[PDB]
Design a protein around this ligand. Structure first.
Ligand SMILES: Cc1ncsc1-c1ccc([C@@H]2CCCCCCNC(=O)C[C@@H]3N=C(c4ccc(cc4)OCCCCCC(=O)N[C@@H](C(C)(C)C)C(=O)N4C[C@H](O)C[C@H]4C(=O)N2)c2c(sc(C)c2C)-n2c(C)nnc23)cc1
Ligand SMILES: [Cl-]
Ligand SMILES: [Cl-]
Ligand SMILES: [Cl-]
Ligand SMILES: [Cl-]
Ligand SMILES: [Cl-]
Lengths: 108, 148, 104, 88
């Protein structure tokens, strides 16, 4: 079980890597509703999530297991899929980052 | 056009600080040089802004339609933020000429169809109608950048 | 900081600057250089309250907040009439006309 | 250093600094006693103009926040006409 969380932190480490920076930068920090001028975001997204928020909970040992870690990762992507139309640029970057997550999360 | 933003797609965090007593209208110059308005800023308020490196920005008074200063100059360009340090854009009031400052007061108290009704020289009727705008200030800026 | 004043005696108004630390006497040196009248022939007033040469402009009530360039604070001035000092008389400025109909 | 006397139409004398008065192009066109007499500018308008001279010299090339120059609606037309005639 501790093997899982160690591998989970390693998966998130690569997600922060520069090789994925071209499309993973909008999800590094929490959604800045003030900076983006988003008024309806907090109304539509009942639970926001980003990559740094995962890092703090992972280092704070708040994830009971790996499945709980993946739920926040999936929650982070879906919020982008729920709020943004499918043709927008940010949805395309969220899919290309989720492909990085799904391919290693499957190979535990 | 010459004054335009570069399509760098490189993000950079910027803070818009309104140190002016009026509502500030931030204007962004796109990649074709055209001015595009952005949400306004109440006086004495600041907010984080997501922009990109090499983009043009100019700020306008929402009441007097006159231009405002940003970091003691007319134009603002976000640089690549270093060490994750935020870039500040202090929007302050300029030192208008007394004539232009007087025009700001007379325009705000008289409907444009009553300018000629006022008892002043006819040369001031034209100046009252010569309302400030981004287009006019952009033409003057480009001429200076064209010859230099 | 710096204060901005309006020294008024009758129909003469002087727009000068000084400091909260500068004394009332140093202000008389300024009036001495402009009007060719030594300090002992001058009395500085502040709306009917006489000012003493040993006090600073800040202690008199002139503040950086209340003596701004766009709205300077007025300083009364009276001159010695040979024998004695004249009464402080500050002639008021003209009055604006009635506001136009189409204004406001 | 040097001061200049600006006389209004109703006999009011306004002594300001030479550099400050030169903000007016009209006054600059007249000067190098050293005094300028305006027969069409009253005292309450010429006083407000001398305040603008101090306001301009102080906050030009300034790095602080610049305050708005106050203008009463009852003198907006008269102050505009003086500003247009003085080129300041
Ligand atoms: C309130 C206020 N008061 C006074 S001024 C002001 C203000 C208002 C708005 C903005 C606006 C705000 C920005 C997105 C507004 C749309 C509404 N949807 C949303 O924000 C939903 C939101 N999507 C994104 C996102 C990410 C990447 C994208 C597209 C979307 O792909 C573009 C990559 C290359 C583009 C280069 C360019 O030059 N791009 C240009 C143009 C050509 C217009 C597109 C550009 O963007 N420019 C020009 C000038 O530099 C200003 C700036 C701008 O327009 N910024 C993000 C996140 S989290 C996060 C950190 C980001 C970033 N995320 C998540 C997880 N889920 N969803 C979302 C800025 C200031
Ligand atoms: Cl905040
Ligand atoms: Cl990869
Ligand atoms: Cl683009
Ligand atoms: Cl740069
Ligand atoms: Cl006596």
């Amino acid at each position: 079980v501790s093997e899982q969380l160690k591998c989970c932190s390693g998966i998130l480490k690569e997600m922060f890597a520069k090789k994925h920076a071209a499309y993973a930068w909008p999800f590094y920090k929490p959604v800045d509703v003030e900076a983006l001028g988003l008024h309806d975001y907090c109304d539509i997204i009942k639970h926001p999530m980003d990559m740094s928020t995962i890092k703090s909970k992972l280092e704070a040992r708040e994830y009971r297991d790996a499945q709980e870690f993946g739920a926040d990762v999936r929650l982070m992507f879906s919020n982008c899929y729920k709020y943004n139309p499918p043709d927008h640029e940010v949805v395309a970057m969220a899919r290309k980052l989720q492909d990085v997550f799904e391919m290693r999360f499957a190979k535990m | 056009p010459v004054l335009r933003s570069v399509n760098s797609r490189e993000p950079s965090q910027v803070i818009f600080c309104n140190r002016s007593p009026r509502v500030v209208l931030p204007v962004w110059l796109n990649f074709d040089g055209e001015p595009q308005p952005y949400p306004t800023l109440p006086p004495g308020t600041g907010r984080r802004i997501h922009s990109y490196r090499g983009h043009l920005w100019l700020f306008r008074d929402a009441g007097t339609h006159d231009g405002l200063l940003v970091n003691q100059t007319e134009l603002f360009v976000p640089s690549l933020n270093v060490d994750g340090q935020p870039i500040f854009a202090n929007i302050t009031l300029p030192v208008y000429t007394l004539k232009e400052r007087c025009l700001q007061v007379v325009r705000s108290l008289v409907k444009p169809e009553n300018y000629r009704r006022l008892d002043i020289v006819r040369s001031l009727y034209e100046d009252l109608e010569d309302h400030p705008n981004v287009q006019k200030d952009l033409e003057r800026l480009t001429q200076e950048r064209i010859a230099h | 900081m710096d204060v901005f004043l309006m020294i008024r005696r009758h129909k003469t108004t002087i727009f000068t600057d000084a400091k909260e630390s500068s004394t009332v006497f140093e202000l008389k040196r300024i009036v001495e250089g402009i009007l060719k009248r030594p300090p002992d022939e001058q009395r500085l007033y502040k709306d009917d309250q006489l000012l003493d040469d040993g006090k600073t402009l800040g202690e008199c009530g002139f503040t950086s907040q209340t003596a701004r360039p766009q709205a300077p604070a007025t300083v009364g001035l009276a001159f010695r009439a040979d024998d004695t000092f004249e009464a402080l008389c500050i002639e008021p400025f003209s009055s604006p006309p009635e506001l136009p109909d189409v204004m406001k | 250093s040097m001061y200049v006397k600006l006389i209004s139409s109703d006999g009011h004398e306004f002594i300001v600094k030479r550099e400050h008065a030169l903000t007016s192009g009209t006054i600059k066109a007249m000067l190098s006693t050293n005094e300028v007499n305006f027969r069409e500018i009253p005292s309450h308008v010429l006083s407000k103009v001398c305040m603008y001279f101090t306001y301009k010299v102080r906050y030009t090339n300034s790095s602080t926040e610049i305050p708005e120059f106050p203008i009463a609606p009852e003198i907006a037309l008269e102050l505009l006409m003086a500003a247009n005639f003085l080129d300041c």
